[PDB]
Symmetry: D2
Subunit: 341 residues, 4 copies
């Protein structure tokens, strides 16, 4: 179009609000809010997908320069703001009372939140593993929806592309900076100095606490320095990243204050914020489900739905799970290998 409403296709957009309670000559006022709220979510889901696909295209390249990294950071930050808005949309729908919802939920019988193609496309494009999902894709009767999901699982997710970018971190290379080995030998040097300082403790409980603590540190570093331990944790589902991607991620977090790593760090932080905000939506949605129809109601066949949503709050659904635990492996500033390159 050309003028405001023609450009925005308001003739199409504002003709998609059909209250089924109205067409059945028993209108329920808040059903208009129910529709509008979901359509605002679906509009922003399309925007999120559009931004995710553009970030996937920029990450599916041999090298990602400082200019392309800034663009990726901008678009990830935009997704963060849209996710906060989407979390904030819940109290607007929580304004409808359970009895008003009960008077129209009968018209929704075949419909299901599981049938949101865009919500699934978001989960898949970010990296929610099909094997890590709770049992409880085949809900989608349409063939274009099934084809859309097939492509989202087949094509590389944001998790795979970020890992590839993380593995190519300059500075990890043995030929050059050799960060991983410098980190291993400074961890050994630091942890021994901690043993020597604890040996000089005037009190025995304090000497023993420090020594027990150093042993727990030894085990923490063993989970990342022994690749067999890391690869076993990845297999269990406690980690997502490859051993080399984790090395890159750890190096980015160590040198975040350096101009060269501040932007890659921000990209990782926004990836974490996205995960955390999708989890916040899941929680607020399960609180709202509970407020409206409790753990189970007429038509639900028990607390099956409720318990499934409650189970989506687990680390099984966090894509960049590894990013939250990087500070466990941190060493003081004085102990970090200085940058030379």
């Amino acid at each position: 179009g050309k003028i405001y409403g023609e450009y925005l296709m308001l003739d199409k957009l504002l003709d998609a609000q059909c209250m089924l309670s109205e067409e059945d000559k028993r209108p329920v006022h808040d059903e208009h809010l129910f529709i509008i709220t979901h359509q605002a979510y679906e509009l922003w889901f399309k925007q999120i997908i559009f931004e995710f696909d553009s970030i996937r295209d920029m990450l599916d390249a041999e090298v990602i320069d400082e200019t392309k990294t800034l663009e990726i950071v901008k678009r990830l930050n935009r997704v963060v703001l849209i996710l906060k808005l989407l979390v904030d949309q819940v109290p607007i729908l929580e304004t409808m009372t359970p009895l008003d919802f009960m008077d129209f939920r009968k018209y929704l019988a075949p419909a299901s939140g599981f049938q949101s193609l865009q919500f699934r496309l978001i989960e898949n494009k970010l990296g929610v593993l099909t094997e890590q999902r709770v049992r409880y894709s085949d809900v989608f009767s349409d063939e274009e929806a099934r084809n859309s999901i097939r492509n989202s699982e087949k094509d590389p997710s944001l998790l795979e592309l970020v890992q590839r970018w993380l593995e190519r971190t300059p500075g990890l290379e043995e030929s050059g900076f050799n960060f991983w080995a410098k980190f291993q030998e400074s961890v050994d040097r630091f942890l021994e100095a901690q043993v020597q300082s604890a040996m000089e403790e005037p009190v025995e409980k304090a000497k023993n606490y420090r020594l027990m603590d150093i042993e727990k540190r030894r085990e923490v570093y063993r989970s990342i320095f022994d690749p067999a331990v890391h690869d076993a944790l990845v297999r269990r589902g406690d980690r997502r990243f490859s051993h080399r991607a984790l090395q890159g991620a750890i190096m980015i977090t160590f040198y975040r204050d350096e101009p060269r790593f501040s932007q890659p760090h921000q990209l990782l932080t926004l990836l974490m914020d996205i995960d955390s905000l999708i989890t916040k939506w899941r929680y607020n949605h399960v609180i709202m489900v509970q407020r409206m129809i409790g753990s189970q109601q007429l038509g639900t066949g028990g607390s099956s739905g409720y318990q499934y949503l409650r189970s989506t709050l687990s680390d099984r659904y966090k894509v960049f799970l590894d990013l939250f635990n990087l500070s466990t492996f941190l060493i003081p500033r004085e102990a970090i290998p200085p940058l030379d390159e």
Copy 2:
């Protein structure tokens, strides 16, 4: 429809996003965000209108009981939450850079924010007076849009209906409680006691300050006790309310802690919050216009647009202007006529 996407008409809704930069084979990524942002606004504008029209129907009645008042309060509070969300949508669009916007604003030449039928319908249904508007309704080329605006100006606004409800306040009546006269004579009694206390001041500057202050209080009460002064202020545009509606509003604010007036008070407060939040959107929108194209750019013909938006921030656009100044006329708790009925 029946299943999720058919119920929500996602086939229609998600087919209304046409980037003109894409159809011209010169696509600008952030134009997708520009469209989606406006469509989320337009969806919520429709919800606001739907709630406003339902509140108008409940207020266009002989008596509004405690049950219907609770429903009106709920729906006004819902509009408050939607307005906060709409204010919060601005930083999402402020994520687009001026240079990216400059690469597609050429395709928008005939379009204008003035062509938002729903934004005008919101202003009119709330009560933005046609005579109080800045010079700078005839923008709308379509006949259904012109007819929609004609009806919104003709049919009673939220301002007119609230005034009618306010005029019917029980307790204002001479036959019963006679609040206005009790308020006048307690104002006189309180202000004289203030003169007597100031007369006993040991310091002359303090006695004189108190006496100058009591004189300014006398003039404040004169603007509401002399109907000629109030009616002149309404004529100037400094007030909106009729003299009897203002009496009701003042009585509701005085006895807000009493169960009988707490709900009418909350209705008035939410009416104020709505005004204040529409003003907050106007401000954030003028800040965003400024960030994107400054006070004037190529195609604007000077700072005409900018200065008009900047002028919409004035009290000329506040519908319930009177509601913000009710605390100027307040007297201590000890001086308020006790409720009997």
Copy 3:
């Protein structure tokens, strides 16, 4: 005092910021933010306690009128707003980097979040049961702190006082409205009508699903109509409320649209919002702990602390647990016993 700084005792308040890294001639800039953030929390914790104690005094009375209920609702809503602000304070402290925190966390060795007297007083005054707490009160070395906690556990909590108020609900009484029996017999009448409608189903899978569903409804109502089942669930820790308090709570939620119950309903909703917002703070605090020092760091002696905080997210810490599940027991509007009194 009398002037601004003397009234606010800014001489005392702005002399309580002692950076231990500064006194050790190794200053860490963000330690100032660490102190200020905690002091803003402690100031608002004192305000929360002050409001909680005033609500406890109003609830520790024979009858609570409509006027005192409005005051309680106002103060509960104030606590909600302060809790949202406190949740929002986390991203301000998350602005400090893990390496900057690592350079001063050594000076905090004896200090512990467990030593916040005001946080414990908040938990106790709301109603966090001492037996429902995770093993992991005796941390407090001072005698006035131990005496403060002793009194908070001994004196009635907000949970006990709300239950007393809920038990005294007019309308529950057999002598008058007899709500519980009317609810039981309308549940029986409604559930049988649902069996008869399911019997007329043309499809067998649909008839069987409806019948399986009605059986699950029968069991839900059994948990509240058989007092032995409710009393067993209270004993297990799945419920907090007495059988009579639950009856009152259910009646308030059923007739919330009625002027008589809207205010008691709002009080219950704000009580739920408080619980939910304290849970949101706990979550954001465990995310921030994780961002700063992961699941374990030098000095922690393993993931003991982290796992304890992670366990505070369970229903074991939700005081008004029962309030979230009231919609499970809801019946359509057509099936609710009409109000007469």
Copy 4:
């Protein structure tokens, strides 16, 4: 100290809450909220000052590297988050009713918001010019407060230091990139091409509108290319920046997408966000003053105070006024001189 309360000096901090209505044996509950709210503001004002002074020290240097720029950006962003929290604190105090405030505002007679030393120190350290202030520093009776303000006006503000940093922008130099001249000659080339395109317009109203518009563009560029026009606008108070600082600011906004300028751009954006958020606090504070005591009340001596606060909303109080208008001078991407260096 060493343990939680000793480290945070909670013995001092939680002993600074003296309600004057309580000491006069006429306690007003919400006076506790009034005190706590102001003390939370004063605590965060101290944090803001601490961050501002550290940014002043980093900016008072010959060269500011990419590493020091990241630190400045981090601390400015922290101030943004604290300012949002401070804006959000207003609705918490707006929870107190005007009648409850009226029962204790008598004890505040000598106190005044003008006596907040920290609020003035914030305004001065940011750059609120003493000559640009409204008539209505000498309020401060204490000598350490007068000395604190004297030093804040004497020592360079954030506005002066940012201008110095902006003037040293590499790329502005004639010897090297010579941005200003390249910008002038590309503006001339672009504006002439616009005349030639308008000359080919089939419609005369369209040709004339385009030509009138190009003339308004010519005048816009004249205000920045003729230093006499810029220096006259600075003198009038419509601009703050020196002609060379404005050149740097314009160059940073033009090449913001380039890695070299993205961080300097972010610093400028956060400086704008700070200005805008202090303005948002001023507005919310004048709305809250109005809600509590209207435009004037007993003790105010008329609307003097109210009108002064209402006048602080003007551009006279915006420190980085110039930053909001930089998009007025923008040219399309195709017209921007390519970077070489």
